[PDB]
């Protein structure tokens, strides 16, 4: 049995503080596990947007796996340095990588995904052999609308470990994208993880998305309100409430409030930029039918 | 019903990053010809092309709110792995059997949502807030082509709803212009009465037609056109006004019949059907030439063909169009 | 062995029209417990009582042809004196030693008559006329309890014959329903493949199981479930198909082994014995609860207990019965 | 020796036209025999269903024996008059009958048998003393399934005249009903009369019934086909072919043809009515196990 089971589980379902708390309590039964624990501790600080902790405490003497988390911390924290980090990352990958260092590949692929470079991120993850590497591949293939390829990688995880948390999560993502009878499958996975662990912002909107997909808007309202009470700034809640609001017949002043609220979510969800782009696309097309 | 083609065995026909599949918003566009589905898809140019050919829109500026708010309800979002860009979900209306290729997006504006808003429009009208009623009426009107509707009777209702919004918008437009005009000259007062009489042929709810007949009854009584004023009074009374107004009306009527003479020849024909030019506010008698709004049915005297309809504020007067499309029914 | 009771002398113990004696058809009923003998006797109520207790019949409508045609072969007729109503003869099967009281009627349907009809059933199946094969199969099935049979081995064969007719009737029922179902949705195609795979576990003749494996091999190959399709191919090949089909099958197999992955989880277990629910066409895995047809062995999921078996069309699912009776042997 | 031997023999074995032909040739060697000949002449016309001959030619001046044949002719010819004839017949019998007029008693008993009144018919025949009266009693007792009583009356005929045609015929009827070793006895009697005289429809089916009783279906097929060629409408052939057909494994479409053919046999054999009754009994019992 895996001494870090609770730690990794808390992280992947979005319960970052519980991850941080339980990482600081476990007993050091190895130096291999010791570094692995620290990786999740610091990725949890990344997830809480506390890049200063990650950046100050991982030193040049720190383990290679931690150097990889710190690389990712630099990129998220320092917008001006991003292009130069990616340039160096391309040079590393072209030179030589330790393929057994799955932590480095997930940190490489994390950087590429943010840099809107899924080919590079898949090219890195292809080199690794680990469950999160597959799980991250499933997510990227789903974003590429290749549900066919996603199913094959998910099937890999199902043969290796049906009951693992990443496999359940990947099953839910694959099911949410397949639709039909499978939307209920995804819902119960998200529910079962909420009622074993704790109903995090990630699981709350996970569940709401499965309701909204079956058109069950009223059943989704409770979940989004609970998510809103926990954290007024989690953007996915705000976006989902815009959808839910309109499907419940509420006034456009509510959709407008959630749009202004989303500009201060200070978590970098693309929705506002795509919205402003569609503002600009529309202004441009108006002048195409009537050049004033 | 033999063994069939289901029994015949057929012809079996580095690292490379994979290529994208079609996005679910593109699937929406492929499978739908209704404007709201393309707007939910984020495909504004194809949506505008559809509204243009079907319903006659050329000035899309006044659609900006509808378009953008519709766009915002199109996709849900959920986080997969921590610290990576979130996922998007694309809820389909035929979700039980949508599959990969056949989806078409969930319905977010229903016809009864609009029929319900008619009531706030009516109240606003009754209490006199014409500018706000017109704004609320036009919003219902422009929203109708964003519907998705199941059966032939709802297509009928959605058309009647458009016609209701038109009737009110042009009627209230007549009254608001009558109030901006000067009442100094005799010839100026004659023009005001005409407009008050035109408004009398708008097809509104009885409670509102009582108010416009009351208005026409005063102006024609002050003009000393008692023969025509009397028939406004007889028509007001037949709608069944509240007791105080019946009494004020009966007293004005028996005074009209004691002198049933019109002092002036006005340009208003009681026994002759016409439509109200929604730009110049003059009557167009049923035989004479008209150019129409292809969505609302607003009538215009022919000078205005090609201009922006004053009622809808977005359509081309007299353009030939396919017709409103708001249901899969219409694509047999 | 003395002089015996054969030597002891015993106690010696108008116009009136005489009364009838027992008729020979009543003698038949007294001396027999087999349904066909009571039908030949014209005693339909007692025949139905026997079929009900022994084999589970409640809906006797579909027996009308068998009953009436059987009745018609029961008695011969011959004229005695001219111009008087003719006589009837009642041919007995034990005629050499029947006497007045012990007769039991001649045998008109033999087990081999039925075994011969199996061949036309098989041909009809091979050429694809499923509706006509099922009708011909059910006729054999309902005819088995009308047999009269000499020894224990013929009772065995008559049971196997029933089981053969059942296997075909439910199998063909699966295929005919698979062909009525739509193939549009992915989820719809998954359901079709399942049914094609269930049919693969019907116990038919090899020439027919080759056709159903060919069908299952196409549908699973088109689905891109290559791991399961490969085992249909290996099983098809082991039955020894004609050379052209072996070649088409070998090519489909070596393509499956170059990608031995199933794309979808279907509800079909290769390594797990089940019975086919003959009403809902879903698998019942050998441990789970079943209600059965008391004559044919058709399996049903428990919801259906008390209903009319879809296979025989005349029996009560799950009724407890004495068992088939078609021989004097069974009444020791 | 009996001058009417050939005439009566032809009648009783069903060779009606030979009876009619030989009755018109014999020389009038009495007035007693003269009337007796006419009785068989007209009963032969009855047997050919030519009731018009019997009805037109027997006048109110005709001999009493002929009045009795004409009575029977009226009953067979006029369905509407049957109940009233039987009513009058009951009144005659209750009033006074000439007991020596065996022709009247056989005509009375013939009417009662058709009227489904064997008690009355036996009561009439009891009063007569003649060979056909006994022979007709044997037939009625056999229909009543009283083979015990039949044997005693047959024994009466055997002591009086072993070689008579009625005694042979009665022996065959008694043997056909006793079965076992006696079925062969009946067969040879029917055969011996066919190969002295002519193989009539009555003798052909007589023989076939003896084969079918011993289960010798294939030996019966020749006889029924020969009977069918002679007269497509004789019903007993049609019924026997239904039995024979099924015992030879022929298709149900053959049993169906003989059933439709039997509806136009236009000779009043009960089989179709009993068949339709069993159709109705079955329909009724189906609704008893499942009241729809």
Curated annotation (Swiss-Prot), chains A, D:
It comes from Homo sapiens (Human). It is found in: Cytoplasm; Golgi apparatus membrane; Cytoplasmic vesicle, COPI-coated vesicle membrane. Phosphorylated by PKA. Polyubiquitinated by RCHY1 in the presence of androgen, leading to proteasomal degradation. This is Coatomer subunit epsilon. GO terms for cellular component: COPI vesicle coat; cytosol; endoplasmic reticulum membrane; Golgi apparatus; Golgi membrane; nucleoplasm; transport vesicle. The gene is COPE. The coatomer is a cytosolic protein complex that binds to dilysine motifs and reversibly associates with Golgi non-clathrin-coated vesicles, which further mediate biosynthetic protein transport from the ER, via the Golgi up to the trans Golgi network. The coatomer complex is required for budding from Golgi membranes, and is essential for the retrograde Golgi-to-ER transport of dilysine-tagged proteins. PANTHER family: COATOMER SUBUNIT EPSILON (PTHR10805:SF0). Its main location: cytoplasm.
From Swiss-Prot, chains B, C:
Keywords: Cytoplasm, Cytoplasmic vesicle, Disease variant, ER-Golgi transport, Golgi apparatus, Hormone, Membrane, Methylation, Phosphoprotein, Protein transport, Repeat, Secreted, Transport, WD repeat. Its main location: cytoplasm. Signal peptide: none annotated. The modification Phosphoserine is found at residue 301. It is found in: Cytoplasm; Golgi apparatus membrane; Cytoplasmic vesicle, COPI-coated vesicle membrane. The keyword Coiled coil does not apply. The modification Omega-N-methylarginine is found at residue 73. GO terms for molecular function: hormone activity; mRNA binding; structural molecule activity. One of its GO terms (biological process) is protein localization to axon. The keyword Cell division does not apply. GO terms for cellular component: COPI vesicle coat; cytoplasm; cytosol; endoplasmic reticulum membrane; extracellular exosome; extracellular space; Golgi membrane; growth cone. It comes from the Eukaryota. Uniformly expressed in a wide range of adult and fetal tissues. Xenin is found in gastric, duodenal and jejunal mucosa. Circulates in the blood. Seems to be confined to specific endocrine cells. It is linked to Autoinflammation and autoimmunity, systemic, with immune dysregulation: An autoinflammatory disorder with systemic manifestations. Clinical features include inflammatory arthritis, interstitial lung disease, alveolar hemorrhage, neuromyelitis optica, and immune complex-mediated renal disease. AIAISD inheritance is autosomal dominant with incomplete penetrance. The coatomer is a cytosolic protein complex that binds to dilysine motifs and reversibly associates with Golgi non-clathrin-coated vesicles, which further mediate biosynthetic protein transport from the ER, via the Golgi up to the trans Golgi network. Coatomer complex is required for budding from Golgi membranes, and is essential for the retrograde Golgi-to-ER transport of dilysine-tagged proteins. Oligomeric complex that consists of at least the alpha, beta, beta', gamma, delta, epsilon and zeta subunits. Interacts with SCYL1. Interacts with JAGN1. Interacts with TMEM41B. Interacts with SVEP1. Probably interacts with PEX11A. This is Coatomer subunit alpha. It comes from Homo sapiens (Human). The lineage of its organism: Eukaryota, Metazoa, Chordata, Craniata, Vertebrata. The chain holds residues 843 to 1224 of 1224 of the full protein.
